[PDB]
């Protein structure tokens, strides 16, 4: 039915009028029952993670008591379904197995990774008191869960020697974006509090700010990376790798980013574009620009960063720095808006742009052109407000069809929920 995306290539319009630019469609269909939902009032579906493999997809969501950024975690649900076609205009889902992780009060975060008829879930846990009370924001180990169609899941426990992370960490959070599976290994992205014992020269790149350099005197850029203004603790990102995933004894290794080329740690994702790889890092401080890196392999040294702005995060932000010259300051954004590449150098890609309105939000869907142009279409004019987005394209009926998973509120007075949609990417040349 569906196949891993094969990128459009210019097979025409290569004479003189050669603007081979793709654009989104004109319809924004729905994908009902992507994951089980409810209608209770004291619930918030808050943290989604979506991934599509060769034919199957993995989906995970988080349910909180009353608050969306906080509150006791009622449960975490994972759905293993297959993308199929039932004669309707667009693609459709068909869950095969719904699963709830045991003891959801010990989890810090979770993410999924869909391969070839095989699903993976990796969750970081926190230290448990003598009574078993979860000591929040501590780190103890990992759980790796194996998923196969028509097959009971298998759980792997990773603790002690099984994980050797570069620096000593105290709290670890797995990026909600997820990961990939190549060969007999896995690749996620994690962030946490890392105790630094050297000099910090944090990355400080900003526009023409003339206040005091816009706080560009690097004291504030260093201040942002520090935990509570202490040099001894930092918030940093790091690659994560699992060895011998087939063997029943996996092992974990990490690779921490230098602060000299990074911003405060946040959620991110791992891509598998072409034969290369990719990584997206969500804004978490004054800098609200796009942060994407294309790497020949999975190594901090070999990572190369993109030089594009959109999508400029503009929601769930506390900053006040013009987006013409992002002037370093101090704030805490809590949004998420990833970009799915549509080329080998990722000069094509597609994203979801959210802009806040007097009330709620106004959103649009766009596909970035390598020439710098964009093609934008307004979407969801009924919903009160949406906050995050996640895209995962694929080949389906000799065409590129993408599924956008979002969360928000259709009615102002309803709790936060998760909504799924799909659209089409069509290639054409002027």
């Amino acid at each position, epitope marked *: 039915t569906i196949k891993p995306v094969e990128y459009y290539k210019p097979d025409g319009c290569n004479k003189t009028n050669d603007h081979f630019t793709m654009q989104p469609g004109v319809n924004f269909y729905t994908v009902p029952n992507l994951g089980p939902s409810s209608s209770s009032a004291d619930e918030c579906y808050t943290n989604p993670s979506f991934s599509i493999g060769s034919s199957i997809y993995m989906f995970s969501q988080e349910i909180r008591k009353t608050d969306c950024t906080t509150g006791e975690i009622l449960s975490i649900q994972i759905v293993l379904g297959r993308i199929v076609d039932k004669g309707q205009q667009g693609p459709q889902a068909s869950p095969l197995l719904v699963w709830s992780v045991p003891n959801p009060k010990i989890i810090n975060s979770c993410a999924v990774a869909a391969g070839d008829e095989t699903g993976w879930v990796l969750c970081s846990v926190t230290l448990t008191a003598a009574s078993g009370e979860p000591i929040p*924001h501590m780190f103890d180990g990992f759980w790796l869960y194996k998923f196969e169609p028509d097959t009971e899941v298998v759980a792997y426990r990773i603790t002690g020697f099984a994980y050797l992370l570069d620096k000593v960490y105290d709290s670890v959070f797995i990026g909600k974006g997820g990961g990939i599976q190549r060969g007999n290994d896995l690749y996620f992205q994690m962030f946490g*509090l890392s105790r630094n014992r050297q000099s910090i020269k944090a990355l400080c790149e900003h526009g023409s700010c003339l206040g005091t350099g816009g*706080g560009g005197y690097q*004291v504030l850029c260093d201040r942002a990376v520090m*935990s509570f203004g202490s040099e*001894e*603790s930092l918030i940093s990102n790091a690659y994560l790798k699992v060895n011998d995933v087939a063997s029943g004894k996996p092992t974990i290794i990490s690779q921490t980013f230098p602060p000299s080329d990074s911003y405060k740690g946040s959620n991110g994702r791992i891509y598998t574009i072409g034969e290369r790889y990719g990584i997206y890092l969500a804004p978490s401080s004054w800098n609200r620009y796009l942060r994407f890196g294309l790497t020949p392999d999975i190594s901090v040294r070999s990572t190369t960063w993109l030089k594009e702005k959109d999508p400029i995060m503009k929601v769930l932000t506390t900053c006040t720095n013009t987006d013409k010259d992002m002037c370093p300051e101090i704030c805490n954004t809590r949004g998420y808006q990833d970009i799915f590449p549509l080329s080998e150098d990722s000069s094509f890609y597609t994203y979801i742009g959210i802009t806040p309105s007097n009330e709620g939000t106004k959103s649009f869907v766009a596909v970035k052109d390598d020439a710098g142009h964009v093609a934008s279409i307004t979407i969801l004019p009924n919903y009160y407000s949406i906050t995050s987005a996640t895209i995962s394209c694929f080949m389906y009926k000799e065409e590129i069809w993408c599924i956008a998973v979002t969360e928000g509120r259709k009615q102002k007075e309803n709790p936060q929920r998760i909504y799924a949609h799909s659209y089409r990417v069509q290639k054409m040349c002027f």
Partner: antibody
Amino acid sequence: DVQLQESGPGLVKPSQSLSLTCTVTGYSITSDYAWNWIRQFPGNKLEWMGYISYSGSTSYNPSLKSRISITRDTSKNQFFLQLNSVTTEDTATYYCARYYDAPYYFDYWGQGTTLTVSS
Amino acid sequence: DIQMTQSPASLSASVGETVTITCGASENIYGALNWYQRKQGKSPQLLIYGATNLADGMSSRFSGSGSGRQYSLKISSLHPDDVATYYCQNVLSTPFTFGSGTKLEIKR
């Protein structure tokens, strides 16, 4: 709301070790925010003394060197304080505040507790 | 460490008059400066955070101003209840050092 109450002895012999306890109610320490220790000298002079974050990372005052030791107990929702050597200079009043992330204030200070050093 | 100079150490004025307190900083802090008031026998209390934002449950006469190195606090319509010590503190980064302190006096 959240309130901090200090408790401990009033007099300490020179060169000995003091103990202080700042019990917090209405919030949990492990949830967020840092919990500091500040002292005001008899000459109306204040001086920050250290802090202990929610994750467990502890920062200290460079001038006070290795003479300080901050701990915590999540079950009681309390965080203690220990000083190694105690000279006549250490006679002052000790408060326990909570460090809000931003806009960077110590909102929620304790009632205070006078400490004297003498044999 | 970071050092700030608080002056004048003491001031005198009559009811209904305006006064200003100044606190300079050794290096730029980008406005991460607080102000506190400590009435006699009581623990200090937040008055201004960020050098410009007022606090809750406080008079509207207190106003904050200043950016970069030098910062000041202003008191308008002096009231008898305003007899305490006013401090300036740096919260930009550890260690958090205070000012020398200033004592207000109402002349009559």
